[PDB]
CSV table of N, CA and C in Angstrom, one decimal:
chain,number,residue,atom,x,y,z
A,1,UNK,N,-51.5,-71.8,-246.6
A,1,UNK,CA,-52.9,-71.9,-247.0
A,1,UNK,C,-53.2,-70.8,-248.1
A,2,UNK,N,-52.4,-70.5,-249.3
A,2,UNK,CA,-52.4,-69.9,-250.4
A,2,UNK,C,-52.9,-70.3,-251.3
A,3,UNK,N,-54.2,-69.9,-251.9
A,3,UNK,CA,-54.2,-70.9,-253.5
A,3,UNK,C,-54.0,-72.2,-253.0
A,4,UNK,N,-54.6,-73.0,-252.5
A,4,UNK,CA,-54.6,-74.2,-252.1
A,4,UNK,C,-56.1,-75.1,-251.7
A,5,UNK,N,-57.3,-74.5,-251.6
A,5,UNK,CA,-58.4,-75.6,-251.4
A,5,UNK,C,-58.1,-76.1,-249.7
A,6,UNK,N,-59.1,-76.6,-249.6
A,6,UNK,CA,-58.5,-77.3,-248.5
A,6,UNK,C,-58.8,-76.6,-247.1
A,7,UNK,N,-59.4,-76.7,-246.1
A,7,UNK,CA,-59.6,-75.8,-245.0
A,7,UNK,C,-59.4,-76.8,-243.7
A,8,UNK,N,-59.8,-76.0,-242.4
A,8,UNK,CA,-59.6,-76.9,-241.5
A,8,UNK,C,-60.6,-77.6,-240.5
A,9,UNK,N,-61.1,-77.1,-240.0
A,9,UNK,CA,-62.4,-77.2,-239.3
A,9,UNK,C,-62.7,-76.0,-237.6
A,10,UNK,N,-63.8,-76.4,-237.1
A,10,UNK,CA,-64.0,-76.0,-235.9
A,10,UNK,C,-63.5,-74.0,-236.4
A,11,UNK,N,-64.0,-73.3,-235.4
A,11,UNK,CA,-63.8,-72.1,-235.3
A,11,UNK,C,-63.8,-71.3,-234.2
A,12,UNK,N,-64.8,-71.2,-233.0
A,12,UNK,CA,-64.6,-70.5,-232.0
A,12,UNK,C,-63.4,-69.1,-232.1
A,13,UNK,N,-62.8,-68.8,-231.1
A,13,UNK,CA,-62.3,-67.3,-230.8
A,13,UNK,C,-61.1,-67.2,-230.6
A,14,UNK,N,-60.7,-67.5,-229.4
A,14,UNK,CA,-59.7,-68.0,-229.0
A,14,UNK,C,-59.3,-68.2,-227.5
A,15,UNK,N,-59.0,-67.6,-226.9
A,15,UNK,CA,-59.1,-67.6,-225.1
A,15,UNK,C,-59.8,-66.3,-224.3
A,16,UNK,N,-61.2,-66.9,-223.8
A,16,UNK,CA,-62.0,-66.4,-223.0
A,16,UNK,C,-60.9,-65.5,-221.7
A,17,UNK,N,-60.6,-64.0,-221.8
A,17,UNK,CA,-60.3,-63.1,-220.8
A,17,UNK,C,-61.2,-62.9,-219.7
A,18,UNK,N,-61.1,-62.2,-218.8
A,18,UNK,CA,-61.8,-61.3,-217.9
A,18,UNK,C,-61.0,-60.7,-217.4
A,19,UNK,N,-60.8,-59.2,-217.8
A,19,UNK,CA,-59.8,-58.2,-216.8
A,19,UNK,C,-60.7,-56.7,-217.0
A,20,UNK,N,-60.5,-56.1,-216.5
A,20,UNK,CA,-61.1,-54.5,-216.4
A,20,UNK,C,-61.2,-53.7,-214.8
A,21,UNK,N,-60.5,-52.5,-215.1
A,21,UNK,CA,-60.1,-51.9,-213.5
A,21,UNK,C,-60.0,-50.4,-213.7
A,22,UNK,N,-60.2,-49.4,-213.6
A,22,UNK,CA,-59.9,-47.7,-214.0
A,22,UNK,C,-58.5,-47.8,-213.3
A,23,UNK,N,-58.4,-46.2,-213.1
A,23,UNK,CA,-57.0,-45.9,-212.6
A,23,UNK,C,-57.1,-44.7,-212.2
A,24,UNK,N,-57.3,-43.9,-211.2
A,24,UNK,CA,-57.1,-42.8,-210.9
A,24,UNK,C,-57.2,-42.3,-209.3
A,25,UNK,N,-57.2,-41.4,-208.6
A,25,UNK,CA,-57.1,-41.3,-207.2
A,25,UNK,C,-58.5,-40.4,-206.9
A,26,UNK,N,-59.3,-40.9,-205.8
A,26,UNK,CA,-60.6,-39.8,-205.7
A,26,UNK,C,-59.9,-38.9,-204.5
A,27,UNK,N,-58.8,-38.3,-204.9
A,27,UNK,CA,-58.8,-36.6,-204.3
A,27,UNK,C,-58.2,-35.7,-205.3
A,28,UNK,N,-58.2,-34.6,-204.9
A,28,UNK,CA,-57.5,-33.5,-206.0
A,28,UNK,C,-56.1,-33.3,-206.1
B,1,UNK,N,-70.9,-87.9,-230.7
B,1,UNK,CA,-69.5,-88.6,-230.9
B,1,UNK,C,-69.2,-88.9,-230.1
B,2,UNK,N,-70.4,-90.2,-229.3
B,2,UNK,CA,-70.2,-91.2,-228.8
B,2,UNK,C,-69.6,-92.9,-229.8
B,3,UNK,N,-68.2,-93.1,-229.1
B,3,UNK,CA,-67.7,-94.4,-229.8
B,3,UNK,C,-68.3,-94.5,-231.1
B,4,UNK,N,-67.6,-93.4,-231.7
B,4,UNK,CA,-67.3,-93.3,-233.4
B,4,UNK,C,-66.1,-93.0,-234.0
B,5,UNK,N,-65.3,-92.7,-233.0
B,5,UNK,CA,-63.9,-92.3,-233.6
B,5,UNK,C,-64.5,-90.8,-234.6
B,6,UNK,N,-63.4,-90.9,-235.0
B,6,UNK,CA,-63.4,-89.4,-236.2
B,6,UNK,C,-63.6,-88.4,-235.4
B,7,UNK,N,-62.9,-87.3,-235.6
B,7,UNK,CA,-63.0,-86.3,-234.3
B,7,UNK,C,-63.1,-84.8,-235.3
B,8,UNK,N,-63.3,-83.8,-235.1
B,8,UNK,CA,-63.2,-82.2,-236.4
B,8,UNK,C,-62.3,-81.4,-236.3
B,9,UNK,N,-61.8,-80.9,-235.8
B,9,UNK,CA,-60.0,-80.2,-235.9
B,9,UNK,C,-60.0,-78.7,-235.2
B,10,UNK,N,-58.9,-77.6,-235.2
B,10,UNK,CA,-58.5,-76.8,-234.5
B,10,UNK,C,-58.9,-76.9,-232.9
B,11,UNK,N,-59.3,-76.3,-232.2
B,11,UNK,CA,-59.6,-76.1,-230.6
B,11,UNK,C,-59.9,-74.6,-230.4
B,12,UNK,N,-58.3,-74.1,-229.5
B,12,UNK,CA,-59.0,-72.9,-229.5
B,12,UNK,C,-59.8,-72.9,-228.5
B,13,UNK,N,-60.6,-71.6,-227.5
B,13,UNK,CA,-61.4,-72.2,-226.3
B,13,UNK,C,-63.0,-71.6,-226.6
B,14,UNK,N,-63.1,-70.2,-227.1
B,14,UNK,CA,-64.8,-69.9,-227.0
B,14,UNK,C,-64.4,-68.7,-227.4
B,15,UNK,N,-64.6,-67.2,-226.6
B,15,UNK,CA,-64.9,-66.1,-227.2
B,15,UNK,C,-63.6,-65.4,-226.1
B,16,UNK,N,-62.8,-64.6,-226.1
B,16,UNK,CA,-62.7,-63.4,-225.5
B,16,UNK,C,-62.8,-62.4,-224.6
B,17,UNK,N,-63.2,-62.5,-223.7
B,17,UNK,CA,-64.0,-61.5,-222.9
B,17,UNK,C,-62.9,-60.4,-222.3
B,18,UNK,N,-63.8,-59.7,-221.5
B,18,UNK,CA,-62.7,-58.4,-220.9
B,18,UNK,C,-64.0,-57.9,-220.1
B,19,UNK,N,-63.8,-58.2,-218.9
B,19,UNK,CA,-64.8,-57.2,-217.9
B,19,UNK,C,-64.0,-57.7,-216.3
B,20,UNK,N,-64.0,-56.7,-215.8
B,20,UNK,CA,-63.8,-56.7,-214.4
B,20,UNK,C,-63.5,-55.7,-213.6
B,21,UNK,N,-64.4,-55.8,-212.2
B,21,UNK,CA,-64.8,-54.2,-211.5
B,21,UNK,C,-65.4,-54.5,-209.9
B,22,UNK,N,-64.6,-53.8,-209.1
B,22,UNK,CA,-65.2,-53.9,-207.5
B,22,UNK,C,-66.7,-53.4,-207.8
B,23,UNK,N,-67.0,-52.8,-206.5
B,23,UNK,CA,-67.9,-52.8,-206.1
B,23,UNK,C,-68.4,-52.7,-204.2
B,24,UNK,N,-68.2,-51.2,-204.1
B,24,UNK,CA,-68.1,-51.1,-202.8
B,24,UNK,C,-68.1,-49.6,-202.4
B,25,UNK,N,-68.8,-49.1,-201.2
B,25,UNK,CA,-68.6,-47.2,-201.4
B,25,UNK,C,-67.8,-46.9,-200.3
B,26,UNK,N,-66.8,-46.0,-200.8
B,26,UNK,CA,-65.6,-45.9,-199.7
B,26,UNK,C,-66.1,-44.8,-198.7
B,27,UNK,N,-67.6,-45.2,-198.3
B,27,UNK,CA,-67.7,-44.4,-196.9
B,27,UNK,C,-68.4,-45.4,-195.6
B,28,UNK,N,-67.8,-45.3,-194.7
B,28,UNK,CA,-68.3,-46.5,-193.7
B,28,UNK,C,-70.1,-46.3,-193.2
């Protein structure tokens, strides 16, 4: 798709995630 | 695009997300 015209359609993002978690220990 | 044929192109799903987290107090 260089110098060429021409496109494609549609756009959206791409794949919906869900992750998120900390990491650490609650003692000293 | 009911029974019209012709359809728009790429796919792809929506947006990307990133969240996820308990929820709870570690004292009885």
């Amino acid at each position: 798709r260089m110098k060429k015209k021409d496109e494609g359609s549609y756009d959206l993002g791409k794949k919906p995630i869900y992750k998120k978690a900390p990491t650490n220990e609650f003692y000293a």
